[PDB]
Structures are given as structure tokens and as C-alpha cells.
Amino acid sequence: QTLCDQYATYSNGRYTVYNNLWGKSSGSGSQCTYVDSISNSGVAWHTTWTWSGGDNQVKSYANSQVSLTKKLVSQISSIPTTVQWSYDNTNTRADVAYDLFTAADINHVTYSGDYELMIWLARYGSVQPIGSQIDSVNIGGHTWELWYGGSTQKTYSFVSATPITSFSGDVMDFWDYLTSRHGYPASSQYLINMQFGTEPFTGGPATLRVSQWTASVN
């Protein structure tokens, strides 16, 4: 499908793709998302955007999403994921990131949570995560900046200083890290959403091509 409207979506079984221009009112621009291939083994998609204004506000988060059974984080065995992606124009202010939400209420809305976990595989330009940097950490064979902030929604962001365009990992390593070292309440939080996509601030035109994304919550 071709997805140019603000909340356009396409789903086929296990994976869903969204245009998700939730922050378009913060600036001026436009964005279209496209599904290239979709199956039980993974999804390929791309999104093209130009954005200006509201320099420190995210304009959108076009993304692919994996279907999951909502489970306590303490009961999840593994969250394997692999992704291959590229940007054609990197002279932008944007990130490429996983986004996960957890909540104590299993029926919480899925686009927010008690906690948000972001894993930024790339940071372009003068943009920064929510909150402030609290440390540099080593997880899964990579060094990450760890950021924390937010009020009603507590957001932890793990940021790679160098773009990782071919990534494989287990997101449970990041939940384990927060559980062990930052008191994250894994035994009372349900994982309710897992997504991968890009947050534009300003720039463009730029096309994120995701040649394959796979994920599973086990």
C-alpha cells in the first residue's frame, strides 16, 4: 500500500506499517510511507519526508510494528530482532530508532506507557533524546549513550554515536540492563508495543529504506 495520510496504515498478518505523522502540527512538511514486501518472515518498507519548523519537536514516527502477546517483561524469554536499513540523504536532523512501551495496566493504550524504551541506531544532526544523558553503557557488543527523562512517561533512550545500519540483537538485553542497574519493575510491567522507524525533526527530502525488519516477542 501507499500511505500518505496522517494516520495511514497497512497490515498483513504479523507486521503492520504506519505513516504516523503524529507531530505534523509542530511544523510544516509532508511524508509518505510505502510497503515493499511483507510476510511472516519480515517486512520491507520505506518512508520519504521533508520537514521544517518546530526545530526540537519530533514530527512523525513512521514505523513497522510486530504483533505480540502482551506479557510481563519478567516472563519474556527473548526479543530477537534484526534490521537492515539505509538513508539516502543524511544531512538532516533525525533519528532511526526502536520504540517499545510497557505499562502496569495490560489494557493501556499502545502508543504510550508507564515506560518507554528507545534504541537509537542512528542520530543525525543536532538532535537529542528525551531528558539528559546519565551514562555510557555496553550492551550486546555495542557502546550506547544512556539517556533518561520524562514525567508521566519515563523514557530510557540508548543511543549509538555511529549509525548501525545492520543490527542484530535481543531487546531483552536492554530490559535486563534496566532491571539490574536502574530498578526497572520488570515483574509488574507488560510489554504492549514494539516498533522500528524514524523520528524526523527537520530536513529533507530524505528516504529511509528498511530492506528487512524482523522481530518476535518470546
Side-chain angles (χ1 to χ4, degrees), residues 7-64:
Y7 292 103
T9 182
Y10 177 80
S11 184
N12 207 339
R14 211 163 160 260
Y15 292 102
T16 303
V17 175
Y18 302 95
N19 202 32
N20 191 37
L21 314 187
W22 62 266
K24 73 164 193 179
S25 70
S26 294
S28 309
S30 53
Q31 175 162 3
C32 292
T33 298
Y34 300 85
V35 183
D36 296 309
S37 75
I38 192 159
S39 74
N40 225 63
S41 54
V43 58
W45 61 279
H46 66 275
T47 188
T48 299
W49 51 267
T50 305
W51 289 108
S52 66
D55 285 10
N56 301 322
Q57 315 300 317
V58 169
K59 306 304 187 303
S60 60
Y61 180 60
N63 71 92
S64 47

Side-chain angles (χ1 to χ4, degrees), residues 8 56 69 87 109 207:
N56 301 322
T69 305
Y87 253 117
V109 297
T207 296

Side-chain angles (χ1 to χ4, degrees), residues 113-141:
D114 293 341
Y115 290 88
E116 175 183 24
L117 167 65
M118 304 195 86
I119 302 165
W120 292 26
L121 301 187
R123 169 180 51 199
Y124 301 110
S126 49
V127 308
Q128 64 176 51
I130 288 155
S132 60
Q133 182 171 3
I134 60 187
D135 213 339
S136 168
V137 309
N138 291 293
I139 302 171

Side-chain angles (χ1 to χ4, degrees), residues 129-176:
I130 288 155
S132 60
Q133 182 171 3
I134 60 187
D135 213 339
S136 168
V137 309
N138 291 293
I139 302 171
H142 302 274
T143 300
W144 310 88
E145 304 171 9
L146 178 56
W147 294 65
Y148 174 75
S151 325
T152 192
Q153 184 165 281
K154 289 143 160 173
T155 300
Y156 287 100
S157 302
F158 296 83
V159 181
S160 181
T162 295
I164 308 171
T165 50
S166 183
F167 176 77
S168 186
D170 187 337
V171 183
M172 282 314 290
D173 285 334
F174 293 86
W175 290 122
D176 282 349

